[PDB]
């Protein structure tokens, strides 16, 4: 929808930009912001959550050529490394693809919340905005943002601008 995103939004991570009679203005939705954060936070904590301890292991550098045993001690340690390295490449890749889809869905969700709220008093412009079909002054706007907009109130006004003129 929003083919772009807003630079200069520093109140939070997701937000509302409105325009009415009283003028334009902006404000961040803190609840869905923290929602994204708390997930990333916890995902991140599980990755960097306390590692192993290891003490007396095998030798991994060698001065002389010994043949068979040494050949095996180095194969073992190389085979280890190669696997753990794969694990780490895959982990990050997965975790990232997720961290993206997580945050894209959070935006997505806020939009729906806002659409269900406006019910039949507004239409989706196509770029992730709404054309609200009534006089929505600044009080009315925060009423939407803070989850209290009663549609049953502006129904008649809106409904009629939409289907007439």
């Amino acid at each position, epitope marked *: 929808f929003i083919e772009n995103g807003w630079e200069g939004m520093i109140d*939070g991570w997701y937000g509302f930009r409105h325009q009415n009679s009283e003028g334009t203005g902006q404000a961040a939705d*803190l*609840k869905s*912001t*923290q929602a994204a*954060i708390d997930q*990333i*936070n916890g995902k*991140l*904590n599980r990755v*960097i*959550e306390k590692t192993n301890e290891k003490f007396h292991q095998i030798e991994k550098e060698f001065s002389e050529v010994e043949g068979r045993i040494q050949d095996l001690e180095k194969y073992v340690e190389d085979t280890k490394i190669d696997l753990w390295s794969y694990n780490a490449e895959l982990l990050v890749a997965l975790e990232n693809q997720h961290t993206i889809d997580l945050t894209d869905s959070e935006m997505n969700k806020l939009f729906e919340k806002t659409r269900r709220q406006l019910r039949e008093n507004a239409e989706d412009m196509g770029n992730g905005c709404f054309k609200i079909y009534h006089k929505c002054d600044n009080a009315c706007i925060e009423s939407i943002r803070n989850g209290t907009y009663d549609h049953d109130v502006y129904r008649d006004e809106a409904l009629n601008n939409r289907f007439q003129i």
Partner: nanobody
Amino acid sequence: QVQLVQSGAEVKKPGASVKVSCKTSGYSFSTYGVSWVRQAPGQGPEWVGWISAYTGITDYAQKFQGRVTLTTDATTATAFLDLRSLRPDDTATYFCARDKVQGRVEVGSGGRHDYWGQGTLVIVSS
């Protein structure tokens, strides 16, 4: 620097309710929630609830639910705790403490109960 000054001891009777203030300072109030823990004399601490100063979200311990209400006032930078229907059981000393990090990037868990109120005694006697 960073501190949490709580209200002086209140004393209330079995029916009534109570409200305890926790004034904060030295850090920006809204980027950190608040955890509340109480302590019946001689026993160990038990957790009461938590509220975010960023998102207004709360999580009460299910033991109290109903009886307990957490709020915050960003202007004065204060968290409040309201407990109703006080039993004599609830006679305890009540602590607030900084907890969770809100908005900001993330982690790990570096607090998470960084700093605590000096404690505020509540006595429920008739």
